[PDB]
Design a protein around this ligand. Structure first.
Ligand SMILES: C[C@H](NC(=O)C1CCCC1)C(=O)O
Length: 165
């Protein structure tokens, strides 16, 4: 189903794409959201995915938090993918801008191993403040399932590919 990806490893693929447009096109089994512990989808990938669901993701998420409380940094939950995917795997990477431990990025990527194939952003990149080059490295060294990474920024995509070891 996924097209135009560059193969980085046996199981990691990358594309310069808007993950919302990619999800609407592919309708993958799992789209990963760059979530926070409260599932407050305000900005970045979460804000964009939520806006694409006409706020249905946020309504569902508020019910999930009311029942279960917040997620842990490094944790995840599976909720509906709405009009974007069969499921959305909300994964909380550490937010460096809130002083969270970058070592939790590996724990965050381990959630991907519970799903055979996923469309995902780089965890903790963007407004979460971590180095995206380091996020890709942790992704490659942690995820064993098939992960299709969508990198929004062209300049960052080129830098990630050209510096990939
Ligand atoms: C989230 C990621 N962007 C970044 O980490 C940089 C922050 C500004 C643009 C590059 C991306 O494009 O997928």
């Amino acid at each position: 189903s996924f097209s135009g990806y560059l193969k980085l490893t046996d199981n990691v693929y990358i594309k310069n794409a808007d993950i919302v447009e990619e999800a609407k096109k592919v309708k993958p089994t799992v789209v990963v959201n760059a979530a926070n512990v409260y599932l407050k989808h305000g900005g970045g990938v979460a804000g964009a995915l939520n806006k694409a669901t006409n706020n249905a993701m946020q309504v569902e998420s508020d019910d999930y938090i009311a029942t279960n409380g917040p997620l842990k940094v490094g944790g995840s939950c599976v909720l509906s993918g709405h009009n974007l995917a069969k499921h959305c795997l909300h994964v909380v990477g550490p937010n460096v801008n809130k002083g969270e431990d970058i070592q939790l990025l590996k724990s965050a990527y381990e959630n991907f191993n519970q799903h055979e194939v996923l469309l995902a952003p780089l965890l903790s990149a963007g407004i979460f403040g971590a180095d995206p080059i380091h996020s890709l490295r942790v992704c490659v060294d942690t995820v064993r399932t098939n992960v299709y990474l969508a990198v929004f920024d062209k300049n960052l995509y080129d830098k990630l590919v050209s510096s990939f070891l």
